[PDB]
Amino acid sequence: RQSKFRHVFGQAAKADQAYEDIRVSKVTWDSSFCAVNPKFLAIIVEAGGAFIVLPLAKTGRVDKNYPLVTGHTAPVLDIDWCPHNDNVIASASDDTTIMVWQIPDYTPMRNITEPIITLEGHSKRVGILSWHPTARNVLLSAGGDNVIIIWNVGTGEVLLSLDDMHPDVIHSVCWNSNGSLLATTCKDKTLRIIDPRKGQVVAEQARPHEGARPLRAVFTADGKLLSTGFSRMSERQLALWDPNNFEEPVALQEMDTSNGVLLPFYDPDSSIVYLCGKGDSSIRYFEITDEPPFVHYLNTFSSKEPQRGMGFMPKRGLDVSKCEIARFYKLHERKCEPIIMTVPRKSDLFQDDLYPDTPGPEPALEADEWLSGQDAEPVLISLRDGYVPPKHRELRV
């Protein structure tokens, strides 16, 4: 099989490119515990609830007295950077709140305790966050109350509240590329595609597939679903679903009988998905194409060190000059180690076929335009122009 990704390989960064002496949270939750953007590395740490934010240039040993973000009163369960502001991060906590933070470029004098805004809509833990890809200041949360809330961060207003659309625990919620639809996984063992503005499930599995449990699901660029989960016999699975025919997967890859939820990291430009879970020492990666069997194993980056979490650098942070197509931020017990994925062209020329124009830091829509039903594609930028800072510095509430 001819693949331009045949020779994609991982390499650990040099020891002095690591972030050392960071107490990674050991709370039992299946989120990645790590959010990275082109400026910052954010990690959920052993605390109440706390996370650390490090400028990417500040490699080596983190000072014992390095300031933390500590506004929450119970463990932090999820963190997500604003796609349209590289100094804004949202945190979700077991305390039932979401806090949205203005991160300084400098080191503050003490712990950051005062967010831009606190969002109080859930009656139970908030373990899922996802910023809207195109609509300014729009933020999704999903809680242990099985409610999905879509917020306007700028006003603190609830735009949409999807209560009781799931009969049991919601494991994951993903936007599609233009933020018109949601994909969800549920403890009732079924996938759903939801139109949040219609308040309707538009596609669902009538019943579980051979008693399998989906725990994560993301959209492919063409609107199919990639799910991860466990078979009836506890075999970890990657599946590709056509939501127009939800009764049989297009493709199913069964792997090992390990315990950890596999997190899918999907590259829509390469059509590559990387899988790894808490406790895994490896990163396994696959190409998705319309040639059968559609899901194509490429390779595995192996190590002797189980991960405690994993960050994934957005496109605007990749080193295009080195044909870096992904950068993982692997969490160990006490450190964060970058792992670089390379397509080895051995060329000083910008590789356009690897780096098509990609969503930039400018929103395509205002919150009210999106709520009124407008759809737009993301505003694309070129990665050849280097780092282009967001127009917005301070998110004003």
Residue 273 contacts residue 262 (beta carbons within 8 Å): no
In eight-state DSSP terms, residue 41 is E
Distances (CA, A) of 25 to 31, 51, 110: 11, 9, 20
Structural method: X-ray
Q: What is the CA radius of gyration of the chain?
A: 20
For 18, the 3-state DSSP assignment is: coil
Q: What is the resolution of this structure in A?
A: 1.6
Q: Encoding tokens for residue 350?
A: 């910008």
CA nearest neighbour of 260 among 24, 31, 20: 31
For 368, the 3-state DSSP assignment is: helix
Residue 59 contacts residue 338 (beta carbons within 8 Å): no
For 347, the 3-state DSSP assignment is: coil
CA atoms of 315 and 36, how far apart (whole Å): 11
H/E segment holding residue 337: strand 335-342
Q: Encoding tokens for residue 47?
A: 């605390």
- In the sheet that 40-45 helps form, which strands lie side by side, from edge to edge? 34-36, 40-45, 50-55
